[PDB]
Amino acid sequence: LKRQEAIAQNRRLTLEDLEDSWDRGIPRINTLFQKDRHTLAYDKGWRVRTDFKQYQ
């Protein structure tokens, strides 16, 4: 809802906005503020890769 209302007012969800829910929930919302965000969007199959890392 915050993202849609920021888009309505032509604004980008701030890390401070994320700070309100600082890494809220099981996952860390903070990641929404990481720099590699764009790069990590192509890192598909990473959980299975990490699980298979034991063989390498």
How many whole angstroms separate alpha carbon 21 and alpha carbon 50? Answer: 27
Compute how many residues bind another protein; rule: CB under 8 A: 17
| Smallest separation (angstroms) from another protein to the CB of 55 | 28
Residue 6, classified by CB atoms within 10 Å of its CB into exposed (0-12), middle (13-18) or buried (19+), is: middle
Residues 15, 29 contacting (CB under 8 angstroms): no
Please identify which residue in 5, 7, 14, 28 interacts with another protein, judged by CB under 8 A: 14
Please identify which residue in 1, 26, 41, 48 interacts with another protein, judged by CB under 8 A: 41
Residues of this chain, 20-39, that bind another protein according to CB under 8 A = 32-38
